[PDB]
Amino acid sequence: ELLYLPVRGRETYEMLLKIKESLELMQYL
Amino acid sequence: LLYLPVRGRETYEMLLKIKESLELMQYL
Amino acid sequence: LLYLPVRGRETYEMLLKIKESLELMQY
Amino acid sequence: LLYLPVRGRETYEMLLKIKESLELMQ
């Protein structure tokens, strides 16, 4: 199962979504 | 209130720290 | 301005991305 | 060693704490 991180607000959510993507790349490299 | 799906627990914890920081930036 | 010390290309580039989001939260 | 320019002490300190967590992680 995925983990589900609670977030308030679409602004913050979208930022974290983008950073997540970068972190996942980092962790694979 | 939204829920961001995350695969790794390491990613999850880092995102949790960044979220805390983003929340506090909203004060400035 | 302050100047954050960073060692390593990868870390610098990640912090640059996180910096952008931190700063945009104000707006 | 590189220096990332940042407007404002609060953002700078936030980024320092994040850097330590990032470095720990990787």
Numbering used by the authors:
A (entry chain A): 360 to 388
B (entry chain C): 361 to 388
C (entry chain B): 361 to 387
D (entry chain D): 361 to 386
What is the paper's account of this structure, in its own sentences?
The three proteins share a similar domain organization, being composed of structured DNA-binding domain (DBD) and tetramerization domain flanked by intrinsically disordered regions. Here, we report crystal structures of different p63 tetramerization domain variants, showing not only marked similarity to p73 but also small differences that may be important for regulating the function of p63 in vivo.
Deletion of the H2 helix has been shown to substantially destabilize the p63 and p73 tetramers, and much higher protein concentrations were needed to shift the equilibrium toward tetrameric species. The primary dimers are formed as observed for the longer variant, that is, by formation of an intermolecular β-sheet and antiparallel packing of the H1 helices. In addition, there are small differences in the structure of the primary dimers, most notably, a difference in packing angle and conformation of the H1 helix. This helix adopts an α-helical conformation throughout, whereas the packing interactions in the full-length variant cause a distortion at the C-terminal end of the helix and a transition to a 310-helical conformation. Key hydrophobic interactions at the center of the primary dimer interface are conserved. Hence, loss of the second helix in p63 and p73 not only weakens the tetramer but also fundamentally alters the overall orientation of the H1 helix packing, revealing a high degree of fluidity of this interface in the absence of the H2 helix.
